[PDB]
């Protein structure tokens with residue numbers, strides 16, 4: 001046996017969530033064999049870990065542990081994606097050296113393991129991690145790969161982890177072209193390529209994304225997250241120009257039957273991040289989160305945590321919210337995780353083993 005007794009498809013009918021306190025429900029969420037496709041490793045940490053970093057480097061001697069969390073993080077949410085991006089820039093204060101980066105990676109993987117994630121695609125932005133202390137992206141990558149390797153080996157590969165590379169917009173020393181070149185340079189370690197930060201229309205980078213994609217690195221980019229944008233151009237470009245296989249967030253797809261039909265026809269999966277959307281005001285409330293409409297419309301959607309460090313949440317919190325506010329069932333969760341497995345960029349030999357073990 002292992003610590004978590006993962007739920008099997010045959011067992012789901014016997015579980016009566018309606019009986020259960022929140023504590024008891026969380027024991028069930030943990031036992032869902034989760035496949036998570038959208039989590040930013042560089043903003044994936046616990047409160048305790050983050051504060052430990054701030055103390056280690058004596059960055060906030062005049063602030064308390066809780067004042068540190070308020071000053072740096074986004075647990076209470078904010079007005080917009082724009083505000084989130086600015087706050088995340090502050091968090092880079094912790095990217096002091098390669099030891100802390102390795103440790104962040106190790107703890108990020110271990111906590112996902114503890115939470116009952118069996119398949120984990122982590123993504124990170126080399127340029128985002130590098131800018132604050134002018135670090136070497138080669139050594140950042142080395143540290144992250146080492147940290148992940150050491151934990152998955154300790155865990156006897158009971159969690160499978162793959163990495164994606166993010167070229168992003170909205171911090172100093174951001175560079176999409178350089179991020180693409182870096183991704184391809186480290187194609188052996190990266191299973192996919194992303195764009196995050198400010199939501200921009202990525203049509204203007206068509207050439208860079210074509211090159212990455214045609215090199216055999218599939219694309220999943222952030223699009224259809226930011227409700228403040230005056231149209232859905234970013235989604236049309238992601239789908240029609242970038243030819244992405246998945247979309248980060250993509251919740252604004254719900255606002256257009258054309259896009260709904262398009263994503264369905266192209267077998268594109270939307271990597272939905274419920275709590276993120278509510279905290280950034282890209283959904284009015286969890287009660288009105290577009291995932292329900294999208295799921296009912298037949299669109300492939302999966303559940304994701306986005307930035308556990310920024311929101312001081314974990315993946316089981318997103319499951320809790322979907323159950324409580326939108327009446328998602330265990331059967332729904334199982335189906336979505338199997339879609340995530342199918343659409344994962346991980347090696348098919350690995351995915352086949354995970355499918356046979358849990359699904």
Ligand SMILES: Nc1ncnc2c1ncn2[C@@H]1O[C@H](CO)[C@@H](O)[C@H]1O
Nearest residue numbers: 040042085088124125128168196197
């Ligand atoms: N939900 C999100 N939407 C857009 N950008 C994000 C999101 N989460 C993290 N990022 C960005 O990803 C990078 C860190 O992985 C930073 O550019 C950060 O702003």
Ligand SMILES: [Zn+2]
Nearest residue numbers: 040196248306
């Ligand atoms: Zn994201």
